[PDB]
Every structure is written in structure tokens, then in C-alpha cells.
Design an enzyme around this catalytic site. Sequence first.
Site, mmCIF file in Angstrom:
data_model
loop_
_atom_site.group_PDB
_atom_site.id
_atom_site.type_symbol
_atom_site.label_atom_id
_atom_site.label_comp_id
_atom_site.label_asym_id
_atom_site.label_seq_id
_atom_site.Cartn_x
_atom_site.Cartn_y
_atom_site.Cartn_z
ATOM 1 N N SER A 394 27.414 7.250 -8.774
ATOM 2 C CA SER A 394 27.313 8.102 -7.550
ATOM 3 C C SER A 394 27.993 8.490 -6.388
ATOM 4 O O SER A 394 28.680 7.521 -5.945
ATOM 5 C CB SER A 394 25.702 8.098 -7.132
ATOM 6 O OG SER A 394 25.341 7.655 -7.576
ATOM 7 N N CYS A 563 17.089 6.171 -4.875
ATOM 8 C CA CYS A 563 18.639 5.682 -5.760
ATOM 9 C C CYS A 563 18.760 3.832 -5.986
ATOM 10 O O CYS A 563 18.048 3.259 -5.334
ATOM 11 C CB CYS A 563 19.980 5.900 -4.918
ATOM 12 S SG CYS A 563 21.095 5.890 -5.712
ATOM 13 N N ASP A 607 17.142 9.087 -8.555
ATOM 14 C CA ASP A 607 18.970 8.217 -9.214
ATOM 15 C C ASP A 607 18.784 6.711 -9.056
ATOM 16 O O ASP A 607 19.522 6.317 -8.547
ATOM 17 C CB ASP A 607 19.439 9.200 -8.288
ATOM 18 C CG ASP A 607 20.861 8.856 -8.670
ATOM 19 O OD1 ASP A 607 21.019 9.217 -9.844
ATOM 20 O OD2 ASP A 607 21.771 8.612 -8.205
ATOM 21 N N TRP A 609 19.491 3.736 -12.074
ATOM 22 C CA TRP A 609 20.170 3.184 -13.547
ATOM 23 C C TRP A 609 19.899 2.397 -13.384
ATOM 24 O O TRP A 609 19.459 1.272 -13.215
ATOM 25 C CB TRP A 609 21.571 3.436 -12.730
ATOM 26 C CG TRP A 609 22.542 2.816 -11.414
ATOM 27 C CD1 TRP A 609 22.870 1.638 -11.683
ATOM 28 C CD2 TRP A 609 22.395 3.521 -10.911
ATOM 29 N NE1 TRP A 609 23.239 0.864 -10.105
ATOM 30 C CE2 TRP A 609 22.861 2.679 -9.448
ATOM 31 C CE3 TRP A 609 22.319 4.578 -10.180
ATOM 32 C CZ2 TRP A 609 23.472 2.598 -8.450
ATOM 33 C CZ3 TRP A 609 23.076 4.979 -8.500
ATOM 34 C CH2 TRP A 609 23.057 3.502 -7.628
HETATM 35 C C1 LIG Z 1 23.658 7.739 -13.219
HETATM 36 C C2 LIG Z 1 24.154 6.566 -12.906
HETATM 37 C C3 LIG Z 1 24.597 6.114 -11.322
HETATM 38 C C4 LIG Z 1 25.573 5.098 -11.215
HETATM 39 N N1 LIG Z 1 25.776 4.921 -10.340
HETATM 40 C C5 LIG Z 1 25.981 3.750 -9.638
HETATM 41 C C6 LIG Z 1 26.861 3.650 -8.478
HETATM 42 O O1 LIG Z 1 26.945 4.804 -7.393
HETATM 43 N N2 LIG Z 1 27.498 2.088 -8.027
HETATM 44 C C7 LIG Z 1 27.242 1.378 -9.266
HETATM 45 O O2 LIG Z 1 27.265 -0.087 -8.820
HETATM 46 N N3 LIG Z 1 26.281 1.071 -10.111
HETATM 47 C C8 LIG Z 1 26.169 2.863 -10.595
HETATM 48 N N4 LIG Z 1 26.381 2.720 -11.799
HETATM 49 C C9 LIG Z 1 26.075 1.732 -12.833
HETATM 50 C C10 LIG Z 1 27.619 2.198 -13.871
HETATM 51 O O3 LIG Z 1 27.330 3.765 -14.724
HETATM 52 C C11 LIG Z 1 27.311 0.777 -14.344
HETATM 53 O O4 LIG Z 1 26.579 0.369 -15.843
HETATM 54 C C12 LIG Z 1 27.838 -0.116 -13.846
HETATM 55 O O5 LIG Z 1 29.182 -0.060 -13.100
HETATM 56 C C13 LIG Z 1 28.261 -1.604 -15.316
HETATM 57 O O6 LIG Z 1 29.042 -1.062 -15.761
HETATM 58 P P1 LIG Z 1 30.759 -2.268 -16.434
HETATM 59 O O7 LIG Z 1 31.672 -1.553 -17.405
HETATM 60 O O8 LIG Z 1 30.813 -2.575 -14.868
HETATM 61 O O9 LIG Z 1 29.939 -3.134 -17.185
HETATM 62 P P2 LIG Z 1 29.624 -3.546 -18.121
HETATM 63 O O10 LIG Z 1 30.632 -3.863 -19.420
HETATM 64 O O11 LIG Z 1 28.966 -1.910 -18.763
HETATM 65 O O12 LIG Z 1 28.515 -4.573 -18.175
HETATM 66 C C14 LIG Z 1 27.011 -3.414 -18.330
HETATM 67 C C15 LIG Z 1 25.974 -4.467 -17.884
HETATM 68 O O13 LIG Z 1 25.538 -5.817 -18.262
HETATM 69 C C16 LIG Z 1 24.254 -6.536 -18.345
HETATM 70 N N5 LIG Z 1 24.452 -7.411 -16.721
HETATM 71 C C17 LIG Z 1 24.666 -7.507 -15.665
HETATM 72 N N6 LIG Z 1 24.174 -8.558 -15.259
HETATM 73 C C18 LIG Z 1 23.502 -9.443 -16.502
HETATM 74 C C19 LIG Z 1 23.340 -10.724 -15.960
HETATM 75 N N7 LIG Z 1 23.867 -11.150 -14.981
HETATM 76 N N8 LIG Z 1 23.137 -11.458 -17.243
HETATM 77 C C20 LIG Z 1 23.217 -10.969 -18.269
HETATM 78 N N9 LIG Z 1 23.383 -9.138 -18.554
HETATM 79 C C21 LIG Z 1 23.394 -8.512 -17.463
HETATM 80 C C22 LIG Z 1 23.828 -5.337 -18.763
HETATM 81 O O14 LIG Z 1 23.140 -5.241 -20.118
HETATM 82 C C23 LIG Z 1 24.843 -4.307 -17.868
HETATM 83 O O15 LIG Z 1 23.863 -2.737 -18.395
HETATM 84 C C24 LIG Z 1 25.722 3.640 -12.447
HETATM 85 C C25 LIG Z 1 24.563 4.445 -13.864
HETATM 86 C C26 LIG Z 1 24.288 5.722 -13.904
HETATM 87 C C27 LIG Z 1 23.857 5.645 -15.412
#
Ligand SMILES: Cc1cc2nc3c(=O)[nH]c(=O)nc-3n(C[C@H](O)[C@H](O)[C@H](O)COP(=O)(O)OP(=O)(O)OC[C@H]3O[C@@H](n4cnc5c(N)ncnc54)[C@H](O)[C@@H]3O)c2cc1C
Length: 610
Positions: A394, A563, A607, A609
Amino acid sequence: PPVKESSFVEKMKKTGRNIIVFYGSQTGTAEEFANRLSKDAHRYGMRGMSADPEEYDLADLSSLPEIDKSLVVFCMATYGEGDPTDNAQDFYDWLQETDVDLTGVKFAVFGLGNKTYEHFNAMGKYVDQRLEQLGAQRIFELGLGDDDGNLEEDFITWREQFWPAVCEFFGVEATESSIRQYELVVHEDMDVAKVYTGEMGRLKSYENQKPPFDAKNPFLAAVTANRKLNQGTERHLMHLELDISDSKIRYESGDHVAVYPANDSALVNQIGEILGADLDVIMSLNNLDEESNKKHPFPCPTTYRTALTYYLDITNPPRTNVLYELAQYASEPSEQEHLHKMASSSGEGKELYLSWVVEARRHILAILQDYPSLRPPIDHLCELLPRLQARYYSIASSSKVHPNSVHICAVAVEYEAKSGRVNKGVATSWLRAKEPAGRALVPMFVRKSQFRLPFKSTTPVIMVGPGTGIAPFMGFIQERAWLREQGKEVGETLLYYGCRRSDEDYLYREELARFHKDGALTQLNVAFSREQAHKVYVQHLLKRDREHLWKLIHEGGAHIYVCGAANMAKDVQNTFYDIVAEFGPMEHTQAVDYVKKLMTKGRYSLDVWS
Ligand SMILES: Cc1cc2nc3c(=O)[nH]c(=O)nc-3n(C[C@H](O)[C@H](O)[C@H](O)COP(=O)(O)OP(=O)(O)OC[C@H]3O[C@@H](n4cnc5c(N)ncnc54)[C@H](O)[C@@H]3O)c2cc1C
Ligand SMILES: Cc1cc2nc3c(=O)[nH]c(=O)nc-3n(C[C@H](O)[C@H](O)[C@H](O)COP(=O)(O)O)c2cc1C
Ligand SMILES: Nc1ncnc2c1ncn2[C@@H]1O[C@H](CO)[C@@H](O)[C@H]1OP(=O)(O)O
């Protein structure tokens, strides 16, 4: 509006297909299922294909009956407010307005949703009900896959009954064996210029940047700022500022920014190393179906290293079909049996898959290590792995104040998986490593949303965003502070924020302070969940201010904004229920309805996620 393809039915007659599976996907899941059901057809003496409904004109459905035993399946996911995925918008709108008769059309639907959202699988339910209304006949029950529990298992369970039902109805039967969608072609004297190095669109797209920019042609924004926001060290919360100068990109507070990350290079080397493969071979995976528009699983030609780095998902727990196709490469019988049993719809196999893979968060490399007998050829592993998806964030800024820059507020993901190893979030680890000023660039694009400030600057604003939820509101506040600076008349602007402790993760403590002092923030109510024995959550503050919030809601026509990550939204929702129920007054029931009416009337936006 893209140019549509010619009649898909006609394309089916030519290529001898009787079943077609469309996908309403945004994050690639629906598409994944579609492709899987499509291949399945072969094991039942039928030939199928998956397709993007956006590239076609669904009105051709009425011609599907021209094919014997023809069948159509729809794998649709839902997005915000029970809306169709961007690529299912044409089809949705069409179903709405059409009166075409679908007599003789056999159909089935599987819905990808998530029970936590308001309109659970709205898209699926709608497609399924609409087609029966247009006169088509349902060949199998509507599927309601829940991403909250385990969508993958919902798909298996549904699928395991779907095919028998199809066979029963059309009088067909079983026959399997491994089949590859692509063919490997190793390039030897390949001129470098013709080799993809991670771009998404056209060759050299990331180097020759020409607008307009979007998901297919992302703009590489330079990172001008990447700072740590939290004071403590329990976690890492960062603030990044992407410069979109000369990108001709427009955005508004409340919009989302999407980025294409790169996998951890060491994770990539190890997958290669352990497979005994050379990640530097230049190759192409060419569709063995010369008819499909999908010429390759991802940009080709390119190297395995590049593929695993920018195009492939190497960190999320593999799905049953992938582990199924891989069992053929485990020299150890016991390990072949486990991998093979992962696609069971019940019993030890299902349990093993649920705990050892999913609950354990074992990525592809982990499985290869915990099953040393498994050594698949690198080229086949790349055909099986899913596509790395863009991660959304966001926008934490207002374009009114920062037109040439896009702000991101995120908490780096890093945790201990029961699998034994430390899992790192793809986009966040990647973002964290981006150091300003060798120009740290971040391939990105903007996606418009329906999370917006009110049109009339006088409308009261209530922003509920604990933890990182405070992201879109940083832009809201700047913009509002900006409206007061521009002499406009602004109504109350209230923030209900939360964190563990003010000396650990109190995000934007200083900035938020500035705004409150200068009056941009009528109220800065912060709930520190861990400074006392009991939890103090944002909703506890909404309850505290019930009297005032109601006055802004019921009389000031204030807009509510929620959010965050994601249980929290529900709590906040019930608090608003109880606020309205006490100050109306009215029953819990007419209260829920009141708050529900506010959502449809555009005065309560969400909003949330993951
Ligand atoms: C519409 C929308 C808006 C968003 N806005 C923001 C934002 O503004 N700021 C923000 O910080 N994020 C936001 N996100 C989240 C962001 O898109 C990602 O999901 C987040 O940043 C993690 O992505 P990554 O690639 O760093 O980790 P990834 O490789 O994508 O890993 C994420 C996955 O790790 C797993 N996981 C996390 N912790 C654990 C745990 N401790 N134990 C087991 N599994 C776990 C979960 O399955 C999670 O889905 C938003 C998501 C959406 C869809
Ligand atoms: C921004 C966003 C909004 C969503 N909105 C809904 C929704 O209204 N209803 C629902 O049932 N699921 C909703 N979901 C969950 C998705 O439908 C579910 O995760 C689906 O598996 C995604 O499929 P895809 O990868 O094929 O797009 C949402 C997910 C995201 C990320
Ligand atoms: N159910 C809930 N309702 C409101 N805030 C919550 C919440 N659950 C956790 N939080 C808070 O969200 C903030 C950001 O993660 C933290 O203060 C966290 O508090 P906690 O971690 O002490 O439970």
C-alpha cells in the site's frame, strides 16, 4: 481492451478438444488449477485446454454444444468486495448484460476464495449461478476452495469427485504416465542480445525503458531511501522511497504498488548445486503444443539461474502435482512413495503433505535435502515450478505531496520454520538489501484501488490501521495536512494506530507527532498492546470513543478505513456493530446491517492482506 482471439470453440474443433478450462487468476493460482484440470482430461480419454477469458469472447459459449461431449470449466478467484479478477472483468460484465441462450452447454465451476473476506467466493458463486440462469446445465457441484484453511486440499477433494462425475455422465473412462508440456532446447552459439536476463516484457525491456508502464512492462524505480522504522530489534520494519520520475506514472493515496523481486542467490545456487546442474546453460522450454499461445513457461531463451532468480517460485511449499511429477526421480522407494502419496485426498499421505510440507513450510530445496534420493533433471523442475509473483504494497504517500515518488512501509519476513531452516520473505529480503546510491532499481508498477480518501475535504475520516496497516494512512494524512495547507476546509481526521511498545515498533513516531501538533491529525490515538499486562488494541480505543465516533458516523457522514494483516478487521467490525447498536439504538442484527450498508455506500473501506 485487448484484441480478442478468434472463437475458442473453433480453435477446439481444429485441435480436437472437447473440454476447456478458463481461469480467473491474479496471483496465478486459478490458472494453476486450470492447467492441472486441463491436462487431467488426457487421463480420461478426452483432450482439453486452459484459457484466459480476457483473450476470448465468452459469448461463443453458445457454440460449444457443436462439439460432442463438450464441457466448460471455470476456475475463478474473487478480489475485494466480491469482485472478479482483473482478467475476468469482461466475462463478468458480459454475464451481467447478456441474454444469450446457453442450452446444451455443460459446465462446472471451482471457486478460489478465502473465508475471512466479506464476499466469500462471490465470483465463483456468481458464475455458477449465472450460467444455469442462461440455460446451461451444471455437470458438477460448485467448488468452494478456502485459502484460509488449505485451498490445495479443497482442490484435490473437489477434483477427485469431479472427474468420476464427468466420466459417468459422458460415458468415458480412465486409461497414466508422465507428460511434458515443454521441450528442452539448449542454445550453444546464442548471441547475448537475444537472451532474457530477468525482464518481464520484451527483450531488453528493463534497460530500454519506454512508457507506458504496467505489470507487463514494469518501470525500474530507483531507491532513493531505505530506512529502518522500528527502534528495537525484534523485527525489521523499513521505509523505502521509490523515485518514479519520468515514468509518467500517476497514483493516489490508497493505491497499491507492485514489485518484481529476485530470489536469494544462495538459495538458487544450492538448488543448482544439489541437482548437480549447471545453472548457466542457456536454454528454452518450447511448448510441445505448437498451437498454444503460451510458447514458453517463462521468458526464453534464458538461463536456469535467471529463471530460478526472477521467473520461478522457489520458496513456497510445492503443490501436490509438482511433488507427484517429481516422485519419478527419487531412487529411494520409500521417498518415491511419500512424494507420490502427497496428492491423496485423505489418510497418511494427506497428513504428511499437510504437516511435513505445508505446516513445515518446506520449499523446493528443503524437500530435495530431506529426500536426498530425489534428483530431477533441472529442465523438468523449471516446467513444474510456479511463476514468481509480484508482491503488492500500500503506497505510503500522497501524490499531491510526492508526485515523483512512491513510498513503501513494510516489515521484512524472516522466521523459523518447523522444517528446521530459517525462511526469508522473497520481496522483503530483496527490498531490505536495496541501498540508495550502482543505482538500486526496483521493477514496479501501480495498481489502482478503491481505497480512497473522501471527495469532499469536509467529510470526517476514521482510519483504523494497527501495525503496518498505518501504511496507506501516512499518505492520507500528508494529503489531508496538505488540504489544510491549501486553505481547503477539512473535517476531523482521526488515526487509530497500534503497536507493541512505543520504544520498539512505533512507526513514524516523529512524523505522526508533527501532524498532530500542526492539527493535520485531529486525534492520534495509539494502542500499545504490550506496555501493560493486558492487550490494548485499536478497537479498545474505538470502544472508548463510541460516543464521538457515532456522532461523526451518524451525523458527520464520516468514512471508516481499515487496513492491516489478517481477525483484527473482524474485531474492529464488531466494535462498530456494538457502537451503532448502543447509540442508535438497535439490535445486533440491525447494527450489523447498518455497518454493512456503510460498506456498500462507500463509507467503510477495507484493505487487509494475507
Ligand atoms: C493488497 C496488498 C497490500 C499489501 N500491503 C502491504 C504493505 O503495505 N506493507 C507490508 O508490509 N505488506 C503488505 N502486503 C503484503 C505483501 O504483499 C507480502 O505478502 C509481504 O511483503 C511478504 O512478502 P515477501 O515476498 O517478503 O515474503 P514471501 O516470500 O511472500 O512469504 C510470505 C509468506 O510467508 C509465510 N509466513 C510469514 N510468517 C510466517 C511464519 N512466521 N510462520 C509460517 N509462515 C509464515 C506466509 O505463508 C506468508 O504468506 C500487502 C499485500 C497485499 C495483497
Ligand atoms: C487484495 C485481495 C483481495 C481478496 N478479496 C477476496 C474476496 O473478496 N473474497 C474471497 O473469497 N477471497 C478474496 N481473496 C482471496 C483470493 O480469492 C484467494 O487468495 C485466491 O486463491 C487467489 O487466486 P489467484 O492467485 O488465482 O488470483 C483476496 C486476496 C487478495 C490478495
Ligand atoms: N486482534 C487484534 N486486534 C487489534 N490489534 C491486534 C490484534 N492482534 C494483534 N494486534 C496488534 O497488531 C499490532 C501490530 O502487529 C500489534 O500491536 C499487535 O498486538 P500483539 O502483537 O501484542 O498482539
